[PDB]
Amino acid sequence: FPTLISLLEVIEPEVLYSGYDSTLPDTSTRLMSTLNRLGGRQVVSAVKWAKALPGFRNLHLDDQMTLLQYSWMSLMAFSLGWRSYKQSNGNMLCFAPDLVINEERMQLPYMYDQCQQMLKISSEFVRLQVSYDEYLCMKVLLLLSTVPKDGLKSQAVFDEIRMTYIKELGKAIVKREGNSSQNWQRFYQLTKLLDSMHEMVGGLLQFCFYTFVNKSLSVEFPEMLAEIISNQLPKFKAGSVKPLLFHQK
Amino acid sequence: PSLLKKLLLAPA
Ligand SMILES: C[C@]12CCC(=O)C=C1CC[C@@H]1[C@@H]2[C@@H](O)C[C@@]2(C)[C@H]1CC[C@]2(O)C(=O)CO
């Protein structure tokens, strides 16, 4: 019998290369434009992943678009945290196999704070020693953790999917531990981590918003990512979006 | 006809 966790493993996309162009002025602007080009391709990969995610296609198309537009930065930063954990134990930002950034190069203008914020996400994977299956279940829950205050068009379907993957997270925890003493404690810690992602990514999103709107910074964005931000940004800045939290705020 | 909508409706 096939399991949901085994399917999450098989649909996880391969890591993308940047195609980086080390033969140029390592300016802050060019690095940010390079990262956004990689980010746009990673979002395309994440859309294809969501289409294959068991249950996601049952949502109204408009809800599928809302969830991807609202959560894309959480997905990208969480996966960056995982790669940086597995490839460098949280010491370097492992954007792609050909684009590994150590924190000396984060001294570039506008780069220090955002790199510290990305490293903090990776440091949580190190602290908790997150397993691959726990990571895969948590990543689905991030896709399902930011919603309009006024609700979704297929609310009942959404409620069912979200509860399904909360249960799957519990199953991944039970598998990680040939015993029982820590199952609830572990679920508590990982749902605390999920809740904390909203704030841990908030500064990254605000910085992205500013580089998108402030054209004099000359940061370039690829086409589909620009479309996504242009829809997400007004909703976030207007306060019309809410996080789904497991614990009292 | 946004790019995201097109991708969600596309086959692959
Ligand atoms: C998705 C992305 C690129 C691909 C990746 O492995 C992880 C991320 C998450 C952080 C993103 C990053 C880039 O897109 C550039 C971003 C948006 C950065 C947050 C702030 C940022 O540096 C900018 O706002 C530059 O304009």
Description:
The complex is a heterodimer of chains A (249) and B (12). Chain A has 249 residues and is mainly alpha-helical. Chain A has helices spanning 4-11, 28-52, 61-88, 112-128, 132-143, 155-175, 183-213, 223-237, and strands at 93-96, 99-101, 146-148, 241-243. In chain A, the strands form two sheets. Chain A has a two-stranded antiparallel ribbon with strand order 1-2. Chain B has 12 residues and is mostly helical. Chain B has one helix at 3-9. Chain B is elongated. The A-B interface holds A 44, 47-48, 51, 61, 64-65, 68-69, 223-224, 227-228 and B 2-5, 7-9, 12. Bound molecules: (11alpha,14beta)-11,17,21-trihydroxypregn-4-ene-3,20-dione. The site of (11alpha,14beta)-11,17,21-trihydroxypregn-4-ene-3,20-dione has 16 residues of chain A, from α2, α3 and α7. Chain B: The modification N6-acetyllysine is found at residue 6. Chain B: A motif (LXXLL motif) lies at residues 4-8.
List the helices and strands and how they pair.
The complex is a heterodimer of chains A (249) and B (12).
Chain A: H1 4-11, H2 28-52, H3 61-88, E1 93-96, E2 99-101, H4 112-128, H5 132-143, E3 146-148, H6 155-175, H7 183-213, H8 223-237, E4 241-243
Antiparallel strand pairs in A: 1-2, 3-4
Helix pairs in contact in A: 2-3, 3-4, 3-5, 3-7, 4-7, 5-6, 5-7
Chain B: H1 3-9
The site of (11alpha,14beta)-11,17,21-trihydroxypregn-4-ene-3,20-dione has 16 residues of chain A, from helix 2, helix 3 and helix 7.
